[PDB]
Ligand binder design. Structure first.
Ligand SMILES: *C(=O)c1cnc2ccccc2n1
Ligand SMILES: *C(=O)c1cnc2ccccc2n1
Ligand SMILES: *C(=O)c1cnc2ccccc2n1
Ligand SMILES: *C(=O)c1cnc2ccccc2n1
Ligand SMILES: [Mg+2]
Ligand SMILES: [Mg+2]
Lengths: 8, 8
DNA sequence: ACGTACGT
DNA sequence: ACGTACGT
């Protein structure tokens, strides 16, 4: 759920 | 030389 | 001359 | 329910 490298 | 994850 | 960064 | 981010 977090987006720091994928954002899902 | 750049540091964006290792910085060497 | 190498690896850091998050939760829904 | 998954991967992005740089050059000395
Ligand atoms: C986001 O909160 C989140 C949490 N756990 C995960 C596990 C695997 C892929 C995506 C994820 N996203
Ligand atoms: C993004 O590509 C990415 C990859 N691995 C991680 C690990 C822990 C926190 C954040 C991350 N983001
Ligand atoms: C920094 O400018 C730089 C450039 N190329 C590299 C290759 C391998 C490890 C470290 C590096 N750092
Ligand atoms: C840092 O851990 C890291 C890893 N791979 C990269 C690829 C391209 C640009 C920056 C990067 N930084
Ligand atoms: Mg460490
Ligand atoms: Mg891409």
């Amino acid at each position: 759920x977090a987006x720091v490298x994928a954002x899902v």
